[PDB]
Design a binder for this molecule. Structure first.
Ligand SMILES: *[C@@H]1O[C@H](CO)[C@@H](O[C@@H]2O[C@H](CO)[C@@H](O[C@@H]3O[C@H](CO[C@H]4O[C@H](CO)[C@@H](O)[C@H](O[C@H]5O[C@H](CO)[C@@H](O)[C@H](O)[C@@H]5O[C@H]5O[C@H](CO)[C@@H](O)[C@H](O)[C@@H]5O)[C@@H]4O)[C@@H](O)[C@H](O[C@H]4O[C@H](CO)[C@@H](O)[C@H](O)[C@@H]4O[C@H]4O[C@H](CO)[C@@H](O)[C@H](O)[C@@H]4O)[C@@H]3O)[C@H](O)[C@H]2NC(C)=O)[C@H](O)[C@H]1NC(C)=O
Ligand SMILES: Cc1nnn(Cc2cc(C(F)(F)F)ccc2CCC(=O)N2CCC(Sc3ccc(C(=O)O)cc3F)CC2)n1
Ligand SMILES: [Ca+2]
Ligand SMILES: [Ca+2]
Ligand code: NA
Ligand code: NA
Ligand SMILES: [Zn+2]
Length: 805
């Protein structure tokens, strides 16, 4: 029910939403069918349009008009945005030269610079270059403000997940808006772009910026806008709220445009029809900036121009149909389109088998334009698993394609030429960021960054303490002139032990063998020194990583590598080594093929054993420091220590061996040395966070040796590649990966070929940020460098994407 016979007289666009059955006058009343009878008449005036003309200047106030050109309009806060231009000889904001805003220049009574978020739907990153001739206001904001060449959205690259990520700083898996369409099974219920289910608060987790603001006594504009409210009226509403008395005026506001997405879907991203929607958005920006300048707020407000995602060319004819792969196509439900999510059609079906569905979708057609995944096997960089609303089965769809269940779904639903939702590293999905105002920097380009980082920055902009989120606070401090948060390194929780030689060979019964009985004072002191850490400055270039949880571990030094060896997990948490440009690759000699050697620094009781590997018919082993990159035949014996061994499926060993034998050396050649930190990851509950011991679901048969879910490496060099990795005076360059530790290579359809035709492609897919690895390991890297901590935080969020320009 609604008693819609109350009135909006004096309540147009009211900020506190009033409860049923009392009728509403706020910017969402239309979307609830709850607006008072007179809302349109009073609050949605349109008479005489949106611009002052010469003839209207000085006019007698007529309250019927949509906006005013009368002499009392500035004081009333309701002039047309162009009033001062037409009626007082002023210039449009866009026509003014840009002048640095060194301090906020605000009217009396302003406690802080307001923040206005100008959000645009489907605003692809390259529009900034390609549409620049038709977007003069946007292009001024961009060149005079702070801007990134692009901003990375979250996956899926859809509207609802990305807007709510912008608002909360959280991955969709955490905030719960995991798609524009979703089914939740604990509610039992379905969320869609249509209908009322999307209004229940129970879908929406986390704490969005407007709630953060309100909880800490910073008043917020209502961010959402009903679709029928035109853009000119949204802008005039924001400008009116900005004229409220000090005690009633919000400090944070949002505008939202449905364009250019709406047109992009119809015409493709660069369709000739796209020029006008870009013109119109720029005009609206101009309205806002002119309106701010009238209110003397244009050198006071911080403005963010931000997109949710980009837009790709997609047409009906590029659709893959599941009914071409499965027999049982009516036993499933598919969430279709630029991603696929599959679940059973019924939970009273015991005859449902995810394994058979995956196998039927795997490498079945030679050009196949999607790949299936169990959600826990998706690239960890997507962070797209830890929610009951994300189906176990996922299809990652090739850019430019769709997936559907049956042909009937595509003709009983060609309409469209653009779409989005693909992998968030795809160039066409990238979107935009510009920050302009006193708190942002002046004429400053910043590197591309992820949208999950902006919540922290918006909180900094408003003097708010951010709710717990997935940004790395400090990583975007380089966007800001002032208001920077001062981050600090997390304290180390566990200090390492530094064991010496404590055990005789015969104390071990590990079932291991090595042909190493081969016998000098010169070289005897020297190797003692290597075991005590004399080469450590070379192999540990950025300090040892800090362990941020309570555990028992040892530092082990060697000629060619250093490691942090966990007595709980029976393997290194990390292994660090430097490979110069000049370093040589060698083979594992024949006599040392199955060599594994007890480590006399580490008790038999805290060691792995070879017998378990022998008995485990599925599980083999590999090494963290590669025997192939030993500095000398003598140092090579160190690589076969039981403390350098890790469990590896034979299928995975093909990937690992190629990485260690070929790719490390290539990277060292190309980057003028690299430092590598490699290690295991355990994420059996796929929450993106380090597992505790008691969460491990798989051990090497008959042992306490836990099986990693993944293996990482972080590969660091000098950004200035004329300087070698081990003598770099300036900023660093990093690429990292998190490889799934899988007993098959079904993910790689070309895996029957030589590793040179597929391994590197796989690794690229599983590119990661350092920060991802930190969450997964409880380690903190880059503790000892010459660089500022904010710069290091930026480095740790970097993702190497492998896309062209
Ligand atoms: C990205 O950033 C986010 C935010 O920082 C990180 O997510 C956090 O991770 C924490 C650890 O996983 C997690 O902490 C747990 O919180 C439990 C209480 O949570 C409620 O309250 C908070 C605060 O207001 C709220 O945010 C939560 O919101 C979630 O759940 C609602 C629905 O209830 C959703 O609407 C919402 O979207 C959100 O869902 C997401 O998180 C939940 C889990 O919280 C997932 O299941 C969802 O899939 C979804 O992703 C909650 O409303 C608290 O009970 C936990 O405490 C247990 O563990 C501790 C460990 O020390 C132990 O002391 C206790 O024994 C306790 O265990 C007891 O309960 C167990 C479970 O029933 C039981 O097994 C035991 O036997 C015991 O009885 C824990 O502290 C935190 O809530 C989330 N926050 C969010 C917002 O997601 C995320 O990790 C970051 N990601 C990366 C990759 O870094
Ligand atoms: C989605 C989403 N998540 N967060 N936002 C707000 C947002 C955040 C940001 C920022 F700063 F973060 F970048 C910028 C702009 C907005 C407004 C989005 C908007 O006016 N829109 C038009 C209505 C549609 S439909 C709809 C209506 C009501 C509700 C509700 O109250 O539950 C939910 C709904 F999905 C939604 C989009 N939108
Ligand atoms: Ca969108
Ligand atoms: Ca985990
Ligand atoms: Na084995
Ligand atoms: Na394969
Ligand atoms: Zn769209």
């Amino acid at each position: 029910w609604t008693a819609t016979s109350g009135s909006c007289k004096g309540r147009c666009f009211e900020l506190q939403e009033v409860g049923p059955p009392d009728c509403r006058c706020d910017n969402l009343c239309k979307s609830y069918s709850s607006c008072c009878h007179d809302f349109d008449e009073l609050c949605l005036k349109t008479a005489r349009g949106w611009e002052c003309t010469k003839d209207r200047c000085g006019e007698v106030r007529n309250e019927e008009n949509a906006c005013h050109c009368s002499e009392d309009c500035l004081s009333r806060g309701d002039c047309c945005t162009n009033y001062q231009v037409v009626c007082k000889g002023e210039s449009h904001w866009v026509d003014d030269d840009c002048e640095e805003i060194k301090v906020p220049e605000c009217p009396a009574g302003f406690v802080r610079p307001p923040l206005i978020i100008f959000s645009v739907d489907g605003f692809r990153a390259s529009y900034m270059k390609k549409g620049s001739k038709v977007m003069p206001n946007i292009e001024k904001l961009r060149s005079c403000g702070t801007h990134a060449p692009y901003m990375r959205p979250v996956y899926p690259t859809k509207t609802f997940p990305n807007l709510y990520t912008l608002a909360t700083g959280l991955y969709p898996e955490s905030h719960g808006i995991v798609g524009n369409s979703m089914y939740d099974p604990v509610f039992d219920a379905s969320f869609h772009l249509r209908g009322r289910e999307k209004f229940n608060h129970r879908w929406w987790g986390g704490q969005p910026l407007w709630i953060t603001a309100t909880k800490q006594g910073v008043r917020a504009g209502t961010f959402f806008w009903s679709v029928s409210i035109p853009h000119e009226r949204r802008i005039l509403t924001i400008l009116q709220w900005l004229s409220l008395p000090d005690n009633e005026r919000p400090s944070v506001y949002a505008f939202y445009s449905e364009q250019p997405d709406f047109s992009g879907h119809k015409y493709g991203p660069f369709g000739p029809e796209m020029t006008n929607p870009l013109r119109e958005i720029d005009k609206t920006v101009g309205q806002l900036m002119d309106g701010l300048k009238q209110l003397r707020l244009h050198r006071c407000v911080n403005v963010i121009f931000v997109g949710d995602h980009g837009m790709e060319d997609v047409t009906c004819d590029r659709t893959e149909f599941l009914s071409n792969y499965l027999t049982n196509v009516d036993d499933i439900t598919l969430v279709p389109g630029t991603l696929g999510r599959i679940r059973a059609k019924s939970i009273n079906n015991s005859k449902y088998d995810p394994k058979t569905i995956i196998a039927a979708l795997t490498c079945k057609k030679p050009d196949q334009h999607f790949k299936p995944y169990m959600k826990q096997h998706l690239p960890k960089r997507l962070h797209y698993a830890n929610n009951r609303r994300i189906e176990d089965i996922h299809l990652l769809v090739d850019r430019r394609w769709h997936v559907a269940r049956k042909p009937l779904d595509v003709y009983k639903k060609c309409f469209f030429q653009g779409d989005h939702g693909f992998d968030n590293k795809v160039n066409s999905m990238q979107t935009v960021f510009v920050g302009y105002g006193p708190t942002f920097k002046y004429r400053t380009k910043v590197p591309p960054f992820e949208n999950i980082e902006l919540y922290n920055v918006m909180c900094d902009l408003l003097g708010l303490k951010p709710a717990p989120n997935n940004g790395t606070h400090g990583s975007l401090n380089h966007l800001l002139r002032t208001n920077t948060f001062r981050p600090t390194m997390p304290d180390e929780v566990s200090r390492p032990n530094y064991p010496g030689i404590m055990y005789l060979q015969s104390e071990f019964d590990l079932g291991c063998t090595c042909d190493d009985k081969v016998e000098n004072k010169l070289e005897e002191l020297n190797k003692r020194l290597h075991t005590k850490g004399s080469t450590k400055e070379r192999h540990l270039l950025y300090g040892r990583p800090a362990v941020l949880y309570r555990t028992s571990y040892d530092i082990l030094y060697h000629t060619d590598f250093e490691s942090g060896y966990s007595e709980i997990f029976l393997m290194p948490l990390w292994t660090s080594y430097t490979i110069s440009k000049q370093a040589e690759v060698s083979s594992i000699p024949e006599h040392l093929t199955n060599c594994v050697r007890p480590d006399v620094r580490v008790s038999p009781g805290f060691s792995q054993n070879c017998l378990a590997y022998k008995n485990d018919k599925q599980m083999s082993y590999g090494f963290l420091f590669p025997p192939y990159l030993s500095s000398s035949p003598e140092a090579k014996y160190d690589a076969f220590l039981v403390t350098n061994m890790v469990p590896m499926y034979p299928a995975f060993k093909r990937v690992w061996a190629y990485f260690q034998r070929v790719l490390v050396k290539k990277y060292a050649s190309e980057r003028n040395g690299v430092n590598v930190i490699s290690g295991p990851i355990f994420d059996y509950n796929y929450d993106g966070l380090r597992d505790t011991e008691d969460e491990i679901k798989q051990y090497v048969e008959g042992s306490s040796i836990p099986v990693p879910t993944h293996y990482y490496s972080i590969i660091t060099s000098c950004l200035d590649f004329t300087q070698p990795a081990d003598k770099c005076d300036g900023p660093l360059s990093v690429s990292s990966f998190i490889l799934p530790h899988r007993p098959d290579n079904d993910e790689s359809c070309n895996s029957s070929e030589d590793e040179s035709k597929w391994v590197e492609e796989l690794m690229k897919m599983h590119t990661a940020r350092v920060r991802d690895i930190e969450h997964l390991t409880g380690l903190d890297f880059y503790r000892k460098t010459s660089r500022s901590y904010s710069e290091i935080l930026t480095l740790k969020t970097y993702l190497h994407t492998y896309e062209s320009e």
